[PDB]
Amino acid sequence: YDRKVPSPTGEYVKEPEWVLETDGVNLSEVMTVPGIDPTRIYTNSFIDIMEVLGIEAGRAALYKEVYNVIASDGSYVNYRHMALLVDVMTTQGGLTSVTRHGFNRSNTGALMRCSFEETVEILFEAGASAELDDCRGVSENVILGQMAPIGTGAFDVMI
Amino acid sequence: MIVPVRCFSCGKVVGDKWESYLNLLQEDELDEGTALSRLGLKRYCCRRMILTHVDLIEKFLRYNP
Amino acid sequence: KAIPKDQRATTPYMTKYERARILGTRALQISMNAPVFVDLEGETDPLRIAMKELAEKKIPLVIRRYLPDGSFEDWSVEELIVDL
Amino acid sequence: ASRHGQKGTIGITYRREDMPFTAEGIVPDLIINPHAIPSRMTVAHLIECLLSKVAALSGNEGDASPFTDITVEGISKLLREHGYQSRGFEVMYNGHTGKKLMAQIFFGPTYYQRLRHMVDDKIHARARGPMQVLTRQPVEGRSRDGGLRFGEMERDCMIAHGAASFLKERLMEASDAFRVHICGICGLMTVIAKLN
Amino acid sequence: ANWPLPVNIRRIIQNAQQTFHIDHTKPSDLTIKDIVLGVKDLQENLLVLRGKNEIIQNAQRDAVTLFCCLLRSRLATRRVLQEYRLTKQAFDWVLSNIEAQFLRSVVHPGEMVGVLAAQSIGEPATQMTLKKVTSGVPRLKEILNVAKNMKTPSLTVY
Amino acid sequence: RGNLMGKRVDFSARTVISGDPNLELDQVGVPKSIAKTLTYPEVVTPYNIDRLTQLVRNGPNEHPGAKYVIRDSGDRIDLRYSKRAGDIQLQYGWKVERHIMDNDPVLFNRQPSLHKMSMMAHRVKVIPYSTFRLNLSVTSPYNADFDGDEMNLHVPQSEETRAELSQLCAVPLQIVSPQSNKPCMGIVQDTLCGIRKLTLRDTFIELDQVLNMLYWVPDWDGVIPTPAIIKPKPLWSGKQILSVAIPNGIHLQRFDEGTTLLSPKDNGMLIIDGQIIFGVVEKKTVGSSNGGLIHVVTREKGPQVCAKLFGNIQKVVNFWLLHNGFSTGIGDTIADGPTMREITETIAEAKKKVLDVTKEAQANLLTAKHGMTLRESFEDNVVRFLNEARDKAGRLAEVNLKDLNNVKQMVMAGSKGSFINIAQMSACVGQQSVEGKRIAFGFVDRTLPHFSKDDYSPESKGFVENSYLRGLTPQEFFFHAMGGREGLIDTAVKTAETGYIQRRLVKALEDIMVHYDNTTRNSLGNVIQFIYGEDGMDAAHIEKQSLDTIGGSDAAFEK
Amino acid sequence: EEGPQVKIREASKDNVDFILSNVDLAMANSLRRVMIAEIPTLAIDSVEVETNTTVLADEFIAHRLGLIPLQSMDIEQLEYSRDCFCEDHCDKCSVVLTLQAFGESESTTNVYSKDLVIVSNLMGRNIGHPIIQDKEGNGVLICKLRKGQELKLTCVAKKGIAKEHAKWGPAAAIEFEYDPWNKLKHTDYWYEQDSAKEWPQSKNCEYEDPPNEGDPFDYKAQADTFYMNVESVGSIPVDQVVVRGIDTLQKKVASILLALTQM
Amino acid sequence: MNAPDRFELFLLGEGESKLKIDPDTKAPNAVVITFEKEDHTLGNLIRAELLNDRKVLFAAYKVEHPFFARFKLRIQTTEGYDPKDALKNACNSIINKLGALKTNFETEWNLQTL
Amino acid sequence: TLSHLRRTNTPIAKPRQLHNTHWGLVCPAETPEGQACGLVKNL
Amino acid sequence: EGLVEYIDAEEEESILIAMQPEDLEPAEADVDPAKRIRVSHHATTFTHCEIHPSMILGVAASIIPFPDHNQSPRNTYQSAMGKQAMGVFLTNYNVRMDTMANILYYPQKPLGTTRAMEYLKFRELPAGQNAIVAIACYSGY
Amino acid sequence: SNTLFDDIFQVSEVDPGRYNKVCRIEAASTTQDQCKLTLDINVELFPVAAQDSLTVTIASSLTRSWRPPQAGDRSLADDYDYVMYGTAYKFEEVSKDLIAVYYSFGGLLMRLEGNYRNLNNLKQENAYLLIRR
RNA sequence: GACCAGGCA
DNA sequence: AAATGCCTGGTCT
Ligand SMILES: [Mg+2]
Ligand SMILES: [Zn+2]
Ligand SMILES: [Zn+2]
Ligand SMILES: [Zn+2]
């Protein structure tokens, strides 16, 4: 691998280093192996990085990952953007999918979930257990044809 | 469908040269190339006009009514 | 749940979205034959006018900034700085 | 479109004069932008022109059959014998000015198709017409004078622009708009409206 | 060393270099105190938050650390004097300038980042269409779904 | 999904689009007929009656006219039928549904709309013929091209609504996009391809034209600038006049590979006081790049000033090119005779290498690298061998290409084309591939019934040696076809799969926004980021700057 | 005489190759264009169809009629219908021709332009005559009929110009070259080796002296001398296209002069 | 269906005069003359002649949009010299040369056989 | 019309890929884009 | 007289096929640099020879000139568009009453043909015109 | 109303790197070995070659819209053949007892190296370049 | 309602 | 449980 490194004289130089790439994962046991620098061991399997190093790390890889997907294509995307994603994917202490199994369960009002994959059902299990929708989601005010907490509807205007 | 009156491109009347052209082919036993030039059709805008035409009307006339 | 004019932490500067709604709402009043608090250098379009009522801080409108808890802060178009 | 996967709509028509012209006085029936070529690697197109040119000239059917020994050379060789630059370029003068064009141009005949789907057959444009009886929402298709779909995706954009008001005005004041009366105790549309 | 940060300082400078017609032949009227203390002071009026309490006053410091680093490395005594012969006037301007710009680079409450981001990732994604790993759409899909059966696992040791 | 969050709205219009070089970036050409249909409820006011009444008199079938007149009671006077349609005395307070006029703000979008940029507000410009006409540099944000795309237009109905479009969603306002934190609109096709030529040192212009070019720029200060040359003939350079387009106060330093404040290669870029000092103008300068003359001009002079920058640069450069001309033909794909020689044999050795590997492998002499089948290693070699071959025959071709070669000529501007295109059109096309592997044995142990079983030689497995110029051979054809297909297919797939992802992302974050305490929370209020993007800075107002304190020797940090 | 001066080389009923020298390129062109687009002419601009048992469509036939060249010498004394105070048309602003053709024989009857029949009163002006340059004298092949097919038309030829429509162009094609050797350097030829061996040599070179090797670049010279040739559809004799061309352009100019005046 | 009638290319409509003369505002002794239902043919010819007058400091022209047939001629002349005059002269000098060409051609055309 | 009369449809491991054996029997190029690409063939 | 046979993909498996007869059955005893490069007739086994490779194509692609000097997918696009082209779909279009019919006023046989268009009756019922085209940057329109 | 630099130069090399109307000239100075010159010249309007004796001049005189003839019988800093106008951008310390400068004539470039010019050379836009024989 | 065909991507 | 967006058109129960 190629790694820039501060030289005694100050400038960054290129000190190539041997690195082992693997075709199989088991993080938990490899760090412990001697000789390797457990400080840097890595894996594209964020889940594993989660279970082993904590979630704050998982978020990291989760991004480190997404990023690579987008940059391997020469394309760039400002941090913040992906950041937000990963974070939104990482605030609930675990790895929450962008699938229905993840964010539609979220704790949100019924209507939001309505606009995504399990309407019918979502509205039943919602009626059964009398859920009260704040009506503060943009997706719901859209259903009721009212302004929403968007740029124009965050601040109120008065005389 | 009938010989275009005048060339799309430049406007040189051409519809008055179809029969002339045909004859030059059949009887004068000439090659499409010279036949054209003899009819005064010297530029290609005016040569494709006749050379490419597909006189379909002759087939539409065989339809009785 | 209100917040005194003091202890005010929100941005002194007016957000684009706030000014676009302020601009719209005044432009609309102006379009409804409402008094104009400015001198027209020869303007006719409500909005274009309303823009000039703001450029001369003469738009009697106040913005109520709700925080995420429920409280809020009332800022007046006279206070708010319009850089943008 | 040509015969090489290169389609295009007309963008303007110019009368003979405004058109660039050949010293011979020949002018093009059509002009395509050089930029629609490097990437599409549709070379045959170019070739076909070389060929169709020579052909029209010598009144010979041009043979652009696939696997043959027909070369771009053999052709360019033929076109020169015909007093033309062996590649298809031909000095041309700018119609407006009459001056010469600093860049010679690829000029020749090329078989072009007239595809169906013509603007006028598409120009739909509605401003509140007939609405569906079931949803009270604008009808589909233009043959019926319907409305355009401001679907999910367009909405997200508006949300992204932070234009709250517009959104409401789109998803309401235009299309669905209805006044309902509700019971201030059981938020159900079970209130008998007797307006008088 | 190249990272996206608000306020292209380099520019402001160039925009003083010729707005005050600065001659690289005569000496500046800058006091070492002026520069040094000025640069410092500038760092007090950037702000992104305005609570008067500890916690928030510390966040505010965080959210500015980096930019400031940029700022300090750029507006350094030698530099100011030796690199771009500013003058008390130009320099003094450059400061008042940065402040304002900074304040202009702040996000506006209302900005719907949720979507703004979702799309910022979805778009360049629909531009993807094709050294033996799982990349592109499939992988991105692998990720977002939080799959456990990833095709190209791997562990990279050092 | 299709009735509540996605409805069919009124006051919408759709047609084919085509580019129009004499339309401003932020406008949109609305075909008279469409304008005569779409309307706008304007209330009667002393600041307008004259115009309003005048229009009502013009009626629904002459452009600056109207349809419908709304009154106090809420009645609709239909202006096309109505014994009293040639009467009607407008009353303050009434409403006159008028046609869409010039300068109205309208939301114009192309689908799929996976951006904000896919929907933008444009100033209306009613014009003849029936296609929406749009400025070219508005092309990319909507990802349109004019091979047939249709586009949708929506008209604001409320005075607010309009404001919301003209103040937030206006095309000007969107030049520097927050996603890539760089601009999202550059200069393309002719204007780009040309601007470069127009710039070459070798490029000079004289009086008659100069005077036209200058005039052509609408914001011209009518002050003819002094010629770069005053000797035997007063000649201006390209840069000279283009610089007229660039406003004052714009500065821009560049430095490409061999730049040196004397750029012998007319390299890099140096713009001072809105005057171009050195460097050819192409994509890097005027493209939609980060450093770009556009990123700088937007940030410095204002969105609008920069909006104008486009038309100006265009109007000038376009005109200049309209008179210089530019084209391409087969000729442009023909390579030096001795070159094709050097190329054909360049391949000739690649084949021998593959062959020499092959025999080695068949002797079992090969040493299998770790983790790979001696078989895997074999394949990988040949594939590498052949790729290089293609790339060098290609490079070999790229060098011939004289600066006068139009293809190369576009590639240099960065207006279309890339090595690959040349390399394939001119020298060897390449090794075809399906599923990341070289063509398979669909038949038993063979590629086609025209080969003998067991034959891993390049020809046999998909290596198209010829060029698109020379022409492919049946087998080559068929092969190249297989890959061709693989492409078209995942093409259809990579679209749906992505379309789906585009949504899950959008739903997932949908409701997240930067609140009034600079925090970032979703509907619930649950904080997601304590400061947006961790610096509470807006993506658009950002740019790649260098932290001068990280690099350099310790000595240099001190010096 | 004064400036602008010609030198006809060739000449006939249809063409007029000639050298136009000591003029500005701007003019050489303005002239060229005008010839192509603003010289008036008579042409069918309205077809009244009574019967069409043909294989061709009405408007399809009508289109071709319009394209058929008609005499136009005395067009200068025929008015624009839009200016004639008549309701629609008359013999002061138009020329009405009749076309009647019946498939008689079972041997396909052809319909030529020679069959149009002027019905209106020409008023003794040479105008509206199916122009015929055929050898056999059958100007243009309009249509063909079968056993018993009918075609009964009535056209109204009006004054018009290439601008409203190309059918009204008298010019056809105009050659035009200047500075046969690129001494003026108004172009930069595209080459593969020798731009001189690859690019042809125009007849027009023979009428001009070469570049003289080591001679510097003539940076002050402009474009003088132009080698043109006007082909002519024939509704107008070639000499006229050139004249009437020159005339028209000249009138166009005058009307702006007259403009300032009324201003 | 949205196509304009061809005649609108050479026929002034209602409220359209062949010329409009507004005083340029950027320069002195400058004037922008807009022409109606006229294209390159005139525009460029007059622009070229207008550049033979040594008391002419500037002169360009443009058809702002092909759709419409109209153009703008800009003129700046030496103090005391009215461009309108600078315009007059030009049109004349033009007509004169034209007449000339008309004759000389007609002359030659007559010495011709065929 | 000719092309319609010489068409092929395949309802429902890799079936839209142009396949070796197809040589000689089905047109390598002619096939619709997206949707049913590779499924609808042409002899 | 057994000079030809009907082979299906299954039997195809067991045969060796020469592409061009000529170019593939002469004995190897200077080469035009502009002609594409072909390998060799290495096979003392040929049991069959292709009637003609151009036959691997079908109706649609058959009308493409030089589709062997064209990038793979562009050939597929054209094949899909040749079906949206106008022209005379039948000499009796006038006697047929059907939902929409588009006919070209002056159809032209292409100056550039294919030895396989003779069977597809293209020259007889052409769909397209032979326009004089110029690839050039003009008004920028 | 001034003049800012005079000096005869001897052209050592003439380079036409892929340009047909421009060559980048590098001529040394006769007299003071310290002075050297790098310039872009339109070889189409003003040929040059192997070892020529070139007279150079700078100044800033004989910014209001440009006019052309008439004065063909007026002012005339036409005592030369070739002449250009430009804007100078950077003054550099070649270090030592030498100093250089950079001018851009609408893209045609020039770098001048010497030292006594600290005074005689301007510091602004104005800058004509005159050459003769 | 069933259904397939097509345009852009 | 879900499987791009939008757009036009044509046939049959
Ligand atoms: Mg497209
Ligand atoms: Zn012609
Ligand atoms: Zn109730
Ligand atoms: Zn009359």
Q: Provide the residue ranges of all domains of chain H, joining segments of one domain with +.
A: 1-114
Contacts of K123 in chain E (CB under 8 A): 23, 25
Contacts of A116 in chain F (CB under 8 A): 507
Residues G41 and G80 sit within 8 Å (Cβ to Cβ): no
Q: How far, in Å, CA of G67 to CA of F536, rounded?
A: 71
Q: How far, in Å, CA of F439 to CA of F495, rounded?
A: 25
Total tally of structural domains belonging to chain G: 2
G212: buried, middle or exposed (CB in 10 Å: 19+, 13-18, 0-12)?
exposed
Q: How far, in Å, CA of E94 to CA of E89, rounded?
A: 9
CB proximity A33 to C under 8 Å: no
K18: left (phi over 0), alpha (psi -120 to 50) or beta: left
Name every residue whose Cβ is closer than 8 Å to that of residue G208 and which is 6 or more positions away in sequence.
G180, G181, G225
Output the six-digit token pair for G240: 């006229």
CATH class, range D131-196: alpha beta
Q: What is the CA radius of gyration of chain F?
A: 30
**In terms of domains, do F117 and F50 share one?**
no
Which residue among H27, H54, H58 places its CB closest to the CB of K70? H54
Closest CA to E110 of K99, C62, A153: A153
Output the six-digit token pair for E50: 């305005």
Residue F161: its H or E element? helix F159-168
Can you give the CATH number for the domain in which B47 is found?
1.10.10.60
> Chains touching chain E at 3 or more Cβ pairs under 8 angstroms?
A, C, D, F, K
**In terms of domains, do F56 and F154 share one?**
no
Pairing of strands G17-21, G94-102: unpaired
Total tally of structural domains belonging to chain K: 1
Rounded to 5 degrees, what are φ and ψ at F159? Answer: -55, -35
CB burial readout G8-18, b (16+ within 10 A) else e: beebeebbbbb
Residue A102: its H or E element? helix A100-103
Q: Is F78 annotated as belonging to a binding site? A: no
Which nucleotide is closest to A119, CA to C1'?
Answer: M1
Q: Within 13 A of B35's CA, how many CA atoms are on the CB side?
A: 22
**In terms of domains, do F248 and F287 share one?**
yes
Can you give the CATH number for the domain in which G215 is found?
3.30.1360.10
Q: How far, in Å, CA of F38 to CA of F55, rounded?
A: 15
Q: Report helix, strand or coil for A16.
A: coil
Reduced 3-state DSSP string for chain B: CCCCCCCCCCCCCCCCCHHHHHHHHHCCCCCHHHHHHHCCCCCHHHHHHHHCECCCHHHHCCCCC
CATH class, range H1-114: alpha beta
D181 CB below 7 A from strand L atoms: no
Determine the straight-line distance between the first and last CA of chain I, rounded to whole angstroms.
14
Contact G25 D99 (CB under 8 A): yes
Which residue among G64, G113, G173 places its CB closest to the CB of B12? G173
Name every residue whose Cβ is closer than 8 Å to that of residue G84 and which is 6 or more positions away in sequence.
G90, G92, G93
Q: Within 13 A of H30's CA, how many CA atoms are on the CB side?
A: 17
Q: How far is CA I39 from the centre of its chain?
A: 5
A117: left (phi over 0), alpha (psi -120 to 50) or beta: left
Q: How far is CA H6 from the centre of its chain?
A: 21
**In terms of domains, do F170 and F190 share one?**
no
Beta bridge partners of G117: G98
Residues F541 and E4 sit within 8 Å (Cβ to Cβ): no
Annotated binding site of B for Zn(2+): 7, 10, 45-46
Reduced 3-state DSSP string for F250-276: CCEECCCCCCCCCCCCCCCCEEECCEE
Compute the distance from residue F69 Cα to the ligand 2 centre, in Å: 56
Which nucleotide is closest to F502, CA to C1'?
Answer: M4
CB burial readout F292-302, b (16+ within 10 A) else e: bbbbbbbbbbe
Output the six-digit token pair for E99: 């402040």
Helix axes F207-216, F303-322, angle to 10 degrees: 150
Tallying the residues shown for chain A, one arrives at 159
Q: How far, in Å, CA of G1 to CA of G3, rounded?
A: 7
Residues D40 and B19 sit within 8 Å (Cβ to Cβ): no
CB burial readout K40-75, b (16+ within 10 A) else e: bbbbbbbebeeeeebebbbbbeeeebbeeeeeeeee
Task: Give the ligand at the shortest distance from the Cα of D25.
Answer: 2
**Percent helix / strand / coil, chain H, rounded to 5:** 40, 25, 40
- Enter the DSSP assignment of I34: S
> What is the per-residue DSSP string for F447-497?
SSTTS-SS--STTTTTEE-S-TTT---HHHHHHHHHHHHHHHHHHHHHHHH
Can you give the CATH number for the domain in which K110 is found?
2.40.50.140
**Torsion angle defined by CA atoms of residues D33, D37, D42 and D43, in that order, rounded to the nearest 10 degrees:** 90
Q: In terms of residue numbers, what domain contains F25? A: 11-37+101-174
CB burial readout F526-547, b (16+ within 10 A) else e: eebbbbbbbbbbbbbbbbebeb
Q: In terms of residue numbers, what domain contains G17? A: 1-40+167-263
Mutate to test the interface with K, among H57, H75, H81 (most CBs of K within 10 A): H57
**In terms of domains, do F290 and F233 share one?**
yes
Q: Which of G166, G190, G214 is the last residue of a domain?
A: G166
Kindly report the number of other CB atoms within 10 A of residue A17's CB atom: 10
Alpha helices (H) in E77-158, listed in sequence order? 77-78, 88-105, 113-122, 136-145
Query: Method of determination?
Result: X-ray
By CA distance, what is K21's nearest residue in G?
G217
Compute the distance from residue G84 Cα to the ligand 4 centre, in Å: 4
Q: Within 13 A of F391's CA, how many CA atoms are on the CB side?
A: 6
Q: What is the CA radius of gyration of chain G?
A: 24
G185: buried, middle or exposed (CB in 10 Å: 19+, 13-18, 0-12)?
middle
Residues F288 and F186 sit within 8 Å (Cβ to Cβ): yes
Q: How far, in Å, CA of G77 to CA of E17, rounded?
A: 74
Can you give the CATH number for the domain in which G99 is found?
2.170.120.12
Contact F236 K106 (CB under 8 A): yes
By CA distance, what is H5's nearest residue in F?
F128
Pairing of strands F119-127, F27-31: parallel
**In terms of domains, do F275 and F420 share one?**
no
Q: How far, in Å, CA of G223 to CA of F446, rounded?
A: 68
For tokens 């009808």, what's the residue? D139
Can you give the CATH number for the domain in which F226 is found?
1.10.274.100
For tokens 């003392």, what's the residue? J44
Beta bridge partners of G118: G97
Q: How far, in Å, CA of F222 to CA of F211, rounded?
A: 9
Q: What is the CA radius of gyration of chain I?
A: 10
Output the six-digit token pair for F35: 């304008």
**In terms of domains, do G172 and G131 share one?**
no
By CA distance, what is J68's nearest residue in I?
I29
Angle at D37 between CA D36 and CA D38, to 5 degrees: 120
Contact A151 C15 (CB under 8 A): yes
Output the six-digit token pair for E119: 């799309």
**What superfamily does domain C1-84 belong to in CATH?**
RNA polymerase subunit, RPB6/omega (3.90.940.10)
**In terms of domains, do F152 and F186 share one?**
no
Residues K55 and K133 sit within 8 Å (Cβ to Cβ): yes
Q: Report helix, strand or coil for F285.
A: helix
Residues D150 and F7 sit within 8 Å (Cβ to Cβ): yes
Q: Which of G166, G195, G217 is the last residue of a domain?
A: G166
Which nucleotide is closest to F147, CA to C1'?
Answer: L8
**In terms of domains, do G184 and G81 share one?**
no
G259: left (phi over 0), alpha (psi -120 to 50) or beta: alpha
Q: How far, in Å, CA of H93 to CA of J61, rounded?
A: 62
> What is the per-residue DSSP string for J80-125?
HHTTSB-S-S-TTGGG---S-----SS-B--SEE-TTTTTTTGGGS
Can you give the CATH number for the domain in which F68 is found?
3.30.1490.180
**In terms of domains, do G193 and G247 share one?**
yes
Output the six-digit token pair for H4: 């304009």
Q: Report helix, strand or coil for H50.
A: coil
Helix axes J72-81, F474-509, angle to 10 degrees: 80
Q: In terms of residue numbers, what domain contains B15? A: 1-65
Contact C20 F167 (CB under 8 A): yes
Q: How far, in Å, CA of D150 to CA of F9, rounded?
A: 7
Residues C21 and A157 sit within 8 Å (Cβ to Cβ): yes
CB proximity E109 to C under 8 Å: yes
Which nucleotide is closest to I7, CA to C1'?
Answer: L5
Amino acid type, G77: Q
Residues K101 and K122 sit within 8 Å (Cβ to Cβ): no
**In terms of domains, do G171 and G240 share one?**
yes
Angle at D146 between CA D140 and CA D147, to 5 degrees: 95
